[model samples]
Target: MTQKTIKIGIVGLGRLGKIHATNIATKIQHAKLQAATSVVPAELDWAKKELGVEEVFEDFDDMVQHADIDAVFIVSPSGFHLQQIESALNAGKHVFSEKPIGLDIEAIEHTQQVIAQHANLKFQLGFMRRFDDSYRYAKQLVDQGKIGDITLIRSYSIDPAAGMASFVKFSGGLFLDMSIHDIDVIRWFTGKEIDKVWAIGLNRAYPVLDKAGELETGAALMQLEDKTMAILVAGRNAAHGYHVETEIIGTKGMLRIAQVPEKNLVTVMNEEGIIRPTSQNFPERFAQAFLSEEQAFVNSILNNQDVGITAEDGLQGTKAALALQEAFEKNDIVQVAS
Candidate 1:
């Protein structure tokens, strides 16, 4: 037998952090939420009280060094990921982290080297869209040749305007933060590297974003290595709700996901005129995917299998995002670096 259970320690207690923490504590199978760490005292207390995580530490270094865990789920801020990943792996633990992987390409290069050194350890990224039910169904259809050959992929990732202010401060930019998910999904479905890209942006809602070199709305046109075209739309300002939709066009047929962004099956028809609520945020839309991704990581650890999303996958996504960022800034088409 490989192992009965995989003990996991989580590093952050922010918004997404709490979701993953709760999943490991109560939802995920073959896993134990053995420990948690945060700089905030109240967050540490929340982990202990709400999640019943007994081994809570105020310092991440202490948790990785001493906690009795088989893996570390790095939900810490983006800037802290590379450091925390190295520490956890050095302590002989498998690692799972939310992307960008690194703030820049140079840091991601270091991350790749570090992960390569530990070939036996599992290193998975939080490209949870790949684990989503709808996305999985689409992938299966494409693989079965039901769609014939893919010609184009168009995706949209829009966030609700409620949390736009705080998100912009630390989001790096629209291309790096929001568009990377769509980029990864396009790659996963097509299995082709992006060869060139053109991009543009605007600050319609938040004009102040001009000072920060960010945008409230952005779009990109990408050409894959195999000449398949992709259109990506990302924004921090969606008036109605958090919206994520995708369409795959192929020779024989097409596959679409969340075209309406409905929150539930119940649609109200009355004074509001066929009103239907939509997902307010990511946690609402991807709750199951978050849980499923963690279970995938845990199973991989116990079974000694390779991770679903590898370090190289993270690097490639980062490269594509960087290329789009450059194109947006220069207002020109740019070739993706190899």
Candidate 2:
């Protein structure tokens, strides 16, 4: 019997959606990009030429209605996930969506219900970090008792904000947009649910963020169910360039991981001293994980197995993020609901 190729449709021809279309068309063995949709004519043209997608739709609903599409990739903004996901599910196509499934619990629960009803259809949450080689290696060490019983974890994500307005107005505050990934990483590594969170934010560098009711920098301490603790720090404006680092301390030893510089050239300036190469942005830095995530989604669909992050994991991350946001607002600790 010949294996049927899975036809992929991509909605939102943004950066992430285009990447997904490229991977499905060129990388995945059993998948093909049948159609793509975007409001931008340039994006549509690029998808047709670059992704080699034959069908391009100006409307997402038309793309979903295309008979050749077996699955859909929804890579729109955080605010648009619920509507797009629901539409794809209703169209009887598998869906793989990027993280922060929804802004609030109600939206997440509704998506979950749709997914639950369509048991045969795959619903993958794009938490690409789980597919990263470094994070996987760290998880292996933790599982093998190489790190002993994990006690504390710290994650730092610092990048120069393009501008205060971009950070404040566009992206979901610092916690939702940036720190949520770290929160998911902590939960993935520790294998424990967060019990409580205490968070604080500061806008000393950019007074505009405060004036706009936004936070430019923030940190949160989360206590897990097993008493393990995790700290997450996110800053939109870092003078030093992009940096990502994680440290896990256990009873036996500690595991530390830092972002590898993009360039191997190290500069030794007479007056300025040693200077290393700046890191690539988050998307470039984690390019491999994104590819791996796409491959895993396809493989799961083929093998009828669970792969990539689940809807439940996405929900949990959103809940934790909201809890942290609440904690920051209240200036007090917020307990995670059981």
Candidate 3:
């Protein structure tokens, strides 16, 4: 069997889009940066000159409809995901889109239906953490009964938001924006859909978040289908560097990941205790996960196999996150219907 080359059209020239495009151009061998589209003309120009991508589009519809590509990588704003994903599938192009596909569960459901209608086109959602080697190992350990009969899962995604306050206008509140990945991870680790969520939010922890009807900190108490208890916490700012950790408790033993600092061995010891280098943000933490998954996406397309993460997976993650969001809005525990 020969590996097929997947020509990809990138729909966003933002930070994430640039990351994916760079990986495709340099790291992923089975893929090609066929074209790119961005809202900013400067981004389009950069794609042409820097990435050596000859075709660029300021209008997404034009690129999806006419770009000479076998697949479309939709890394644009969440608002554009629902429409652009459908458009690419409608044009018979494979798609790999970002997670929490949309803020609205209803919209994601509709998009899932449309994606269902196009079975020939491969559709994948970006949940990079799942593809991380440590998480992958944790998953295998659980499957091998290292954690016998899982009972509890706790996740922390408290990290510096950088410019999160600027996004509250369209970032889908706190849970949907920051904790969706955590929500998805609990589901993935538990291997079950969440059945309920009880959540709460803090109103004014930061001045920048004052104008936004959003929270600087939030927490969701989740119940998985198997009666597993899960707690996921997320925050907009951390004085320390980024901290993403998860602990899973089972009947036999408990498993933990990232409870300690990573990517460094230079631990400084003093009277105050120990200090070490911690991951600054997602790009540093999941950089390899992001790179490996893009490679997997290209290989999946080349081999004509299904991508690891599906639209249904994206929808379920959104559903759970939205239920938590609604729980905060209603100030009550909410039931998530599948």
Candidate 4:
């Protein structure tokens, strides 16, 4: 039997958007980059010239409504996700959206209502870390109780300082922008919602962040529904590279992932001792996971199956992050609202 190809219309052509477009165009099997929408002329040109995308639109709604695409990959800004998702679903298209589905609970609830109306459609969020090989392996161990009862989870997301100036302006703050991924990981591994959070932050490294009302460093102590402890540290001051690491401590044993943040297995032995280059950016560190995420979306659409990551997952992450943000701002513990 011949496999059905999914025609995908992608929104936004920024860094992450470009990666998704390239993957859909060349890397993903049974998928086609049918159309692309971008506000930037250069990105649109790149889509057409490099990826050979036939349909290009400056307006997202135009592409969603008119493009001959079976699915919409929304790598657009976080502010646009809820509306774009509603539009795509109403237009009879499956959707794969980037994280923070909504900035607040109200928006997410409205999105959930829209999703409920289109029960037949598949909607998946971009929690790409869930698709990563190491994460998946650890998930299996946890599922099989190999790690025993999880007592604590420690997660860190440290971005390079090079991009802080450009990133802080529209980052929606550190908790929402950087810590959401770590929050999602905690929820995914434990299969429990965050019950409460106590957070603190400082803006030591980046003066530019002060203007944007953002943080250079932040840490949160989260209590899960089951009372499991989680420590999340997120910052934009890693001078060396993009570092994302996690540890799960359980009764029987423990699991540590990406502890070294090494770009590859190659280690240098010299005067500076054993040295290994680390991932410099998110695109490099999560490249395979991004590919896998898109593939999973395409596969689910073609097979008429439910998405592994739902809008609810996105809402949960946002809720936890928002609570952490509130805690930081108030300098007090905040409850994670249901």
lDDT of 4 by residue, 252-331 (tens): 99989998688987889999998898899999999999999999999998888886687789888888888888898899
The 0-to-1 C-alpha lDDT of every candidate, in the order given, reads 0.90, 0.82, 0.83, 0.90
lDDT of 3 by residue, 62-97 (tens): 997888899989998888899999888888999899
Clash number for every model? 0, 0, 0, 0
lDDT of 2 by residue, 1-338 (tens): 56678888887777677777788889888889988888889998998888778898888888887747889888878888888898899989888998879897888899889888888988898888788888889888999999799999999877665544565555557788777788888888877899999999999977777766678789989889988889999888876566677899999999887653344456656767766776557666677898999888877888888875778889889888888888998999999783
Question: What ranges in model 3 sit over 4 Å off?
Answer: 161-170, 207-211, 270-273
- C-alpha RMSD in Å of predicted model 4 compared with the true structure: 1.4
C-alpha RMSD by candidate, in order:
1.6, 2.3, 2.1, 1.4
True-structure lDDT of candidate 3:
0.83
Best candidate according to TM-score: 4
Model 2 residue 35 CA deviation in Å: 0.9
Error of 4 at 173 (Å): 0.9
Which of the two, 1 or 4, has more TM-score?
A: 4
Kindly give the stretch of ten consecutive residues in candidate 2 with the minimal lDDT sum. Answer: 259-268
Q: Candidate 2: global Cα-lDDT?
A: 0.82
